[PDB]
Amino acid sequence: CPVPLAHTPTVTKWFKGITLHLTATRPTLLTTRKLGLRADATAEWITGTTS
Amino acid sequence: FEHATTVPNVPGIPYKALVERAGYAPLNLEITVVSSELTPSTNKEYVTCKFHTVIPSPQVKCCGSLECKASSKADYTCRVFGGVYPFMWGGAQCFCDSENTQLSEAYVEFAPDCTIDHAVALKVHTAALKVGLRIVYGNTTAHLDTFVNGVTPGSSRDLKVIAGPISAAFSPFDHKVVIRKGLVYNYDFPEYGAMKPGAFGDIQASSLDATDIVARTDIRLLKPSVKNIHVPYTQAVSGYEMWKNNSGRPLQETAPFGCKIEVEPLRASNCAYGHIPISIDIPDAAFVRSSESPTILEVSCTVADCIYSADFGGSLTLQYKADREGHCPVHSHSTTAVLKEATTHVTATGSITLHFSTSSPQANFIVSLCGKKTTCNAECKPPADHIIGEPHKVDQEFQAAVSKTSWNWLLALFGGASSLIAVGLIVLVCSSMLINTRR
């Protein structure tokens, strides 16, 4: 089944941290995890323009 | 002849080592883990999905008793009720005005869609890390696959590669996991037979096609409290679906060390954790005698401007004097630095420029060319970009991360303090000597 690909997130890089600029018209499941010992599992249904 | 080395367990990173075959000219050796395949040991506990309640057509003995006999069906919970006097579309449907006993029946089976919508719970233990290796050494390259148990030789071509055990025991999967549609969730599912009504594991069986279905659903049948024939009943919301609504997110977004979880079989791909001990027997025909290879009489290291970073932000140059042309190996004996290049077609005399990466701002490492050794010493600066698209090609040691200048300042301040306590001892001695010398 085809699924959308919201406009590629414009990443902003800063000291030991990144700012994801986000733009989605419909609920988009942003999920991230740290590759460290702890996974720091994160998931958030992003909507609209945000960061 | 055999060689052995530890290897950082990071996918895609080409680790590099130099094999010093004694009187043979050294040979480059890059160990590259193409992929990793941490396969947990697993067994199917039970299949489960949305239980499809089946209330079979009621049975009626309009003027006599009905047995509430048992049956093997999952949560088979039939009960008998009197005075039913049920009406069908055609009208009354019983022999008697009063003594009409009615048997109501209910049981559950897997819904038809369960063939896809099912999930399987599995206990998992003692996961063994499999790995794909690509080995390049000298003019020869080879690719291999090996279970990193430290026992099995996943030999291929001529490389007698043996690997493991893992420097750290790890598995992303906890001992209880559930697989669904290729997704997987760590979850303390209830044991087989432990069906709880309204929670995950509502209905269970060893196979989805099996008739050997066991279930607990709190199914209860009420009196046919209406003139139209019916079999009113209630039950707990399919615990499986209730779970789905609140399952938590899958391990693909929760497994640590970046390992990408995959199914069929349940396994963890590209895990990045600890280090891998590696030993490699290589056929001596792959090397050459030191007199056949070139060798360098004189060499020196001058480091260009360099950046300590995950990428090859450092660059160095070496002047060399050699007996003849040929491909000398080049490598960094120091653990905190790795060269991008691994071979150089050395001329009789000239210089080479090499790219390297380092995690220590002090570019203080010993480079080697054709086995000769040369010390490099430079101050690398931090990169201008905070984040890059590549993992660090080298780890860092805090003892090595102290800069030559910061290290000098620290040792100078503690040197001062230590000199003041030394002066303390000096004067505590001389104060005794002042008395004892002129008593």
Side-chain angles (χ1 to χ4, degrees):
Chain A
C1 301
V3 294
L5 291 170
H7 284 322
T8 309
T10 293
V11 64
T12 290
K13 306 162 184 285
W14 48 269
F15 175 60
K16 294 179 72 179
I18 59 174
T19 298
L20 298 168
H21 295 297
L22 305 174
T23 52
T25 169
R26 303 308 296 187
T28 295
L29 189 89
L30 189 164
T31 60
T32 69
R33 58 179 177 150
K34 296 181 69 176
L35 286 88
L37 285 67
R38 66 174 65 258
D40 188 27
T42 60
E44 183 169 12
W45 287 105
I46 295 292
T47 54
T49 173
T50 193
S51 64
Chain B
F1 166 92
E2 75 186 323
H3 173 66
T5 181
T6 49
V7 178
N9 182 28
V10 184
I13 291 297
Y15 170 78
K16 303 175 53 154
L18 187 80
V19 54
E20 295 178 332
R21 179 71 176 89
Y24 292 74
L27 208 77
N28 56 83
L29 167 61
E30 317 194 326
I31 299 180
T32 81
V33 285
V34 177
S35 60
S36 64
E37 275 284 17
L38 176 58
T39 168
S41 307
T42 78
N43 65 276
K44 198 200 309 291
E45 287 299 339
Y46 48 83
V47 65
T48 185
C49 67
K50 170 179 294 299
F51 68 72
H52 170 236
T53 321
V54 54
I55 52 98
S57 165
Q59 184 175 359
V60 291
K61 291 295 298 183
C62 303
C63 308
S65 185
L66 266 164
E67 70 280 13
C68 54
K69 68 178 299 295
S71 189
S72 61
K73 305 293 171 63
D75 211 2
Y76 184 87
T77 303
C78 323
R79 294 214 303 150
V80 179
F81 306 86
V84 62
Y85 192 60
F87 266 61
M88 218 155 280
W89 162 248
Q93 182 44 93
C94 254
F95 287 79
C96 283
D97 309 349
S98 184
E99 300 185 302
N100 310 272
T101 63
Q102 184 260 45
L103 168 64
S104 283
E105 181 151 72
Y107 68 99
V108 307
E109 77 279 316
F110 303 133
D113 291 338
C114 296
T115 188
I116 289 302
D117 197 45
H118 74 75
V120 282
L122 298 94
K123 285 191 196 88
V124 305
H125 297 278
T126 55
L129 186 141
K130 197 180 78 98
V131 72
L133 265 306
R134 172 272 302 283
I135 303 302
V136 52
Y137 66 118
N139 299 84
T140 305
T141 301
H143 303 69
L144 278 72
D145 190 293
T146 291
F147 292 88
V148 189
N149 54 24
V151 182
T152 183
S155 180
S156 185
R157 291 68 169 165
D158 305 322
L159 291 303
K160 312 303 179 178
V161 175
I162 181 164
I166 316 298
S167 78
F170 166 68
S171 60
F173 315 109
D174 195 8
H175 89 299
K176 285 189 174 177
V177 303
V178 57
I179 302 174
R180 169 186 160 71
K181 303 182 68 178
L183 304 179
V184 64
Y185 310 76
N186 61 307
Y187 184 84
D188 59 319
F189 58 78
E191 189 57 88
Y192 179 44
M195 301 72 61
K196 302 303 300 181
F200 179 83
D202 46 0
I203 184 183
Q204 303 183 155
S206 191
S207 184
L208 189 137
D209 62 336
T211 302
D212 188 21
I213 311 183
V214 296
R216 296 292 184 266
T217 64
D218 195 24
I219 275 165
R220 60 185 67 200
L221 299 88
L222 276 63
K223 178 178 178 184
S225 307
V226 49
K227 169 153 61 168
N228 306 69
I229 179 62
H230 209 274
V231 57
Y233 81 104
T234 52
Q235 57 188 359
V237 171
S238 51
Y240 157 75
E241 207 296 300
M242 154 67 213
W243 167 68
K244 183 144 50 54
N245 194 78
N246 295 74
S247 64
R249 190 71 193 158
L251 213 79
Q252 281 79 8
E253 292 138 33
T254 313
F257 301 122
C259 211
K260 187 183 71 68
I261 307 304
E262 198 170 291
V263 298
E264 310 313 320
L266 178 70
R267 66 203 211 290
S269 182
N270 301 331
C271 290
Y273 68 104
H275 303 271
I276 313 301
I278 304 292
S279 306
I280 304 101
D281 185 21
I282 296 103
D284 310 44
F287 309 129
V288 301
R289 287 294 212 190
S290 303
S291 202
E292 177 60 25
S293 176
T295 188
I296 47 150
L297 295 75
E298 165 69 324
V299 59
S300 66
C301 175
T302 292
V303 197
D305 199 6
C306 66
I307 301 295
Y308 56 97
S309 74
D311 58 300
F312 299 118
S315 176
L316 80 150
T317 68
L318 300 96
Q319 270 69 18
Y320 63 81
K321 313 288 289 293
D323 56 358
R324 67 173 298 152
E325 80 303 323
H327 279 276
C328 279
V330 288
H331 181 249
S332 164
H333 294 180
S334 302
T335 188
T336 64
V338 178
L339 282 59
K340 179 178 174 71
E341 298 84 358
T343 51
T344 65
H345 187 82
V346 88
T347 65
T349 57
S351 303
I352 311 298
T353 73
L354 301 174
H355 303 85
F356 78 93
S357 66
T358 185
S359 56
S360 56
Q362 49 149 5
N364 187 108
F365 51 80
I366 38 166
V367 175
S368 180
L369 190 178
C370 255
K372 279 278 278 284
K373 296 176 64 175
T374 306
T375 299
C376 297
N377 60 326
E379 291 84 3
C380 298
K381 288 166 288 180
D385 48 339
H386 302 278
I387 309 296
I388 72 142
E390 195 171 13
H392 283 264
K393 292 177 193 293
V394 66
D395 203 357
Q396 73 283 357
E397 168 61 308
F398 202 90
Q399 175 63 95
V402 189
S403 83
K404 171 171 158 283
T405 63
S406 61
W407 200 4
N408 283 358
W409 268 77
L410 264 60
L411 293 175
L413 265 289
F414 294 120
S418 57
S419 77
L420 267 69
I421 180 61
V423 166
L425 177 64
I426 286 169
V427 79
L428 292 170
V429 166
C430 296
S431 52
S432 180
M433 307 296 94
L434 283 174
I435 299 175
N436 286 282
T437 307
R438 294 186 175 178
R439 179 62 71 82

